[PDB]
Enzyme design. Structure first.
Site, PDB file in Angstrom:
ATOM      1  N   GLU A   1      10.337  -5.474   4.881  1.00 46.04           N
ATOM      2  CA  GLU A   1       9.210  -4.849   5.290  1.00 46.04           C
ATOM      3  C   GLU A   1       7.799  -5.522   5.336  1.00 46.04           C
ATOM      4  O   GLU A   1       6.961  -4.886   4.697  1.00 46.04           O
ATOM      5  CB  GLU A   1       9.401  -3.289   4.608  1.00 46.04           C
ATOM      6  CG  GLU A   1      10.449  -2.584   5.005  1.00 46.04           C
ATOM      7  CD  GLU A   1      10.151  -1.877   6.410  1.00 46.04           C
ATOM      8  OE1 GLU A   1       9.025  -1.253   6.764  1.00 46.04           O
ATOM      9  OE2 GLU A   1      11.115  -1.997   7.453  1.00 46.04           O
TER      10      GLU A   1
ATOM     11  N   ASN B   1       0.694  -1.116  -0.119  1.00 43.37           N
ATOM     12  CA  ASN B   1       0.048  -0.081   0.155  1.00 43.37           C
ATOM     13  C   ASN B   1       0.701   1.224   0.090  1.00 43.37           C
ATOM     14  O   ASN B   1       1.643   1.245   0.894  1.00 43.37           O
ATOM     15  CB  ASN B   1      -0.758  -0.121   1.333  1.00 43.37           C
ATOM     16  CG  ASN B   1      -1.937   1.175   1.118  1.00 43.37           C
ATOM     17  OD1 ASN B   1      -2.663   1.332   0.026  1.00 43.37           O
ATOM     18  ND2 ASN B   1      -2.449   1.443   2.547  1.00 43.37           N
TER      19      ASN B   1
ATOM     20  N   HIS C   1      10.814   2.673   4.765  1.00 48.56           N
ATOM     21  CA  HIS C   1       9.620   1.424   4.161  1.00 48.56           C
ATOM     22  C   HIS C   1       9.944   1.014   2.669  1.00 48.56           C
ATOM     23  O   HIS C   1       9.970  -0.095   2.323  1.00 48.56           O
ATOM     24  CB  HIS C   1       8.303   1.806   4.563  1.00 48.56           C
ATOM     25  CG  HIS C   1       7.489   0.654   4.052  1.00 48.56           C
ATOM     26  ND1 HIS C   1       7.378  -0.388   4.776  1.00 48.56           N
ATOM     27  CD2 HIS C   1       6.402   0.661   3.136  1.00 48.56           C
ATOM     28  CE1 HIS C   1       6.303  -1.176   3.874  1.00 48.56           C
ATOM     29  NE2 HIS C   1       5.691  -0.533   3.240  1.00 48.56           N
TER      30      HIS C   1
ATOM     31  N   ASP D   1       5.723  -5.133   2.007  1.00 48.45           N
ATOM     32  CA  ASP D   1       4.320  -4.665   2.847  1.00 48.45           C
ATOM     33  C   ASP D   1       3.291  -5.975   2.812  1.00 48.45           C
ATOM     34  O   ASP D   1       3.558  -6.822   2.891  1.00 48.45           O
ATOM     35  CB  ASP D   1       4.103  -3.196   2.222  1.00 48.45           C
ATOM     36  CG  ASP D   1       3.115  -2.505   3.081  1.00 48.45           C
ATOM     37  OD1 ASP D   1       3.305  -2.196   3.891  1.00 48.45           O
ATOM     38  OD2 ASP D   1       1.869  -2.733   2.309  1.00 48.45           O
ATOM     39  N   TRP D   2       1.966  -5.356   2.150  1.00 45.93           N
ATOM     40  CA  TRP D   2       0.928  -6.294   2.104  1.00 45.93           C
ATOM     41  C   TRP D   2       1.224  -7.534   1.167  1.00 45.93           C
ATOM     42  O   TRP D   2       0.615  -8.444   1.374  1.00 45.93           O
ATOM     43  CB  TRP D   2      -0.340  -5.643   1.956  1.00 45.93           C
ATOM     44  CG  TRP D   2      -0.881  -4.990   3.079  1.00 45.93           C
ATOM     45  CD1 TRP D   2      -1.192  -3.834   3.681  1.00 45.93           C
ATOM     46  CD2 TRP D   2      -1.727  -5.729   4.136  1.00 45.93           C
ATOM     47  NE1 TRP D   2      -1.712  -3.553   4.734  1.00 45.93           N
ATOM     48  CE2 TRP D   2      -2.163  -5.013   5.152  1.00 45.93           C
ATOM     49  CE3 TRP D   2      -1.957  -7.320   4.267  1.00 45.93           C
ATOM     50  CZ2 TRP D   2      -2.718  -5.369   6.063  1.00 45.93           C
ATOM     51  CZ3 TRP D   2      -2.652  -7.671   5.422  1.00 45.93           C
ATOM     52  CH2 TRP D   2      -3.069  -6.612   6.296  1.00 45.93           C
TER      53      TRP D   2
END
Length: 288
Positions: free
Chosen positions: A122, A33, A266, A98-99
């Site tokens: 991450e 995201n 990130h 991330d996701w």
């Protein structure tokens, strides 16, 4: 030998970048995201000589369709599974952030046969307390606000702060005006930003939402037992993952090499594309 394509998936379509047939493995790149396949643009060219690279835009992101759905984690699972089926992807090396990591972990828990390797960074893990989310207190306060009804709608849907501020804020270098125009393109309206607001509300923090927490706890048990080769990239200070947490995580996993990239937050792809791409390229021959 690179193309942006589209494929019918469930009630909609998904877009993806493909580098085409290769004697090497199929390498599936999964963004988070509020990015898209675009975040891999400076990494894929390093991997393409060694494998067939596929980088989808998650449903509601990038150039994928915008169906009338909730955009929960479970919706992304279903759309990604149907994307994999529609392309006939079988054995795969996963590259995720991330996701995308949560999707990768849950895929590997259900279909371990197919997962030949995982390069990740991450990543999402269940967070028992808010102190386990991120590393800066001001970031915790912002995500508490995103997760608050009404407030999160104003910040993310109306003001578009995730795309316009959070994304460039977690890159050390400055994203150019043209790069930002690409990142903003999927999200011209409040309605189009629904997937961006739902994701932070899916993060398993303090056990809520309980359904995501339980599924990701199980995915992490499978990851801990798994034997396929892994690369964990980490920045300093990072964002979701501190350098110390990354070292412990890579030490406890099986067959996992830790790559400390140096200064980074990130969106490590935007600060270290050559190091990430070259490292993946040097590691793929271990898989083949």
């Amino acid at each position: 030998a690179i193309e942006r394509r589209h494929v019918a998936v469930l009630d909609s379509t998904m877009s993806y970048v493909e580098t085409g047939a290769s004697d090497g493995p199929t390498v599936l790149f999964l963004h988070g995201n509020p990015t898209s396949s675009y975040i891999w643009r400076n990494i894929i060219p390093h991997v393409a000589p060694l494998g067939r690279c596929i980088a989808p835009d998650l449903i509601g992101f990038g150039q994928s369709g915008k169906p009338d759905i909730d955009y929960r984690f479970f919706d992304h699972v279903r759309y990604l599974d149907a994307f994999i089926d529609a392309l006939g992807i079988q054995d795969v090396v996963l590259v995720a952030q991330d996701w995308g990591t949560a999707l990768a972990f849950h895929l590997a828990a259900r279909r371990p046969d197919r997962v030949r390797g995982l390069a990740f960074m991450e990543f999402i893990r269940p967070m028992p307390t808010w102190d386990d989310f991120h590393q800066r207190p001001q970031a915790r306060e912002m995500f508490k606000a995103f997760r608050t009804p009404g407030v999160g709608e104003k910040m993310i849907l109306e003001d578009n702060v995730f795309v316009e501020k959070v994304l460039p804020g977690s890159v050390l270098r400055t994203l150019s005006e043209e790069e930002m125009a690409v990142y903003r393109a999927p999200f011209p309206t409040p309605e189009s930003r629904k997937p961006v607001l739902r994701f932070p509300r899916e993060l398993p923090i303090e056990g809520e939402p309980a359904d995501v927490a339980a599924i990701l706890e199980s995915a992490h048990r499978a990851l801990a037992a798994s034997t396929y080769p892994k690369l964990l990239f980490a920045g300093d200070p990072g964002a979701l993952i501190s350098p110390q947490a990354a070292e412990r995580f890579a030490a406890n996993l099986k067959n996992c090499r830790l790559i400390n990239l140096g200064p980074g937050l990130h969106y490590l792809q935007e600060d270290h594309p050559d190091a990430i791409g070259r490292t993946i390229a040097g590691w793929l021959p271990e898989i083949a």
